């Protein structure tokens, strides 16, 4: 595996270079949204982002070394966590709002337009606030998103994945040491970052139930791909 031979700086460069693009929403200018229109915009956006996520995952050092079935398992387990941590990341510079896309910046009142969405909006906004208060850096963000990909499904299958995870840990500490953090500050920040992954997991599971409920409510047809990722949790 080539990933284990990389320096911390090479790992950061590879992950930054792997980053998917920020996509736009369909340029529906009609405000306000209805339940069906907001759901349409969000599911269409999620579906296009998923295609880019799958190609990003192939560029995460160590992910291509896994078998196809293990790659499938990890992405099926983690896909909504990954979409959510990405949304929270790009919403950091918009306190009180969620930047679903550059032309789709929503506040929590607009979350009420969809039944059951406001609880999930509030959790995402809270995560964005926590990232901002921690001054999360882009290099730290890409490490965490890769950790989610490798970690979320690994307990429902191993040694190779845990070695890559160990390498990302080394890379997080390296970034913090470079920023001048003392040893005590380094392990404290490492724990603080990784504890937020437990909240991202919670948000994903809440979001998965909400997507399943929107599926049953049948307000908007979900894409075949989104349904396949959703069905992997039921």
């Amino acid at each position: 595996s080539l990933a284990l031979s990389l320096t911390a700086d090479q790992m950061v460069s590879a992950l930054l270079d792997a980053e998917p693009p920020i996509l736009y929403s369909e340029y529906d200018p009609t405000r306000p949204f209805s339940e069906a229109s907001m759901m349409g915009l969000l599911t269409n956006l999620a579906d296009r982002e998923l295609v880019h996520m799958i190609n990003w995952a192939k560029r995460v050092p160590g992910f291509v070394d896994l078998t196809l079935h293990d790659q499938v398992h990890l992405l099926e387990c983690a896909w909504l966590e990954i979409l959510m941590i990405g949304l929270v990341w790009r919403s950091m510079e918009h306190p009180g709002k969620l930047l679903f896309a550059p032309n789709l910046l929503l506040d929590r009142n607009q979350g009420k337009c969809v039944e059951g969405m406001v609880e999930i909006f509030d959790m995402l906004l809270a995560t964005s606030s926590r990232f901002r208060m921690m001054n999360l850096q882009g290099e730290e963000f890409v490490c965490l998103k890769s950790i989610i990909l490798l970690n979320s499904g690994v307990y429902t299958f191993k040694d190779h994945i845990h070695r890559v995870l160990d390498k990302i840990t080394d890379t997080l500490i390296h970034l913090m040491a470079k920023a001048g953090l003392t040893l005590q500050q380094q392990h404290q920040r490492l724990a603080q970052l990784l504890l937020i992954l437990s909240h991202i997991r919670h948000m994903s599971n809440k979001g998965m139930e909400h997507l399943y409920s929107m599926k049953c409510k049948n307000v908007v047809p979900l894409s075949d791909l989104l349904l396949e990722m959703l069905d992997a949790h039921r």
Partner: peptide, 11 residues
């Protein structure tokens, strides 16, 4: 069969 399978095998 899975769409995920195709996307992972393709570029």
């Amino acid at each position: 069969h899975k769409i995920l399978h195709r996307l992972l095998q393709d570029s």
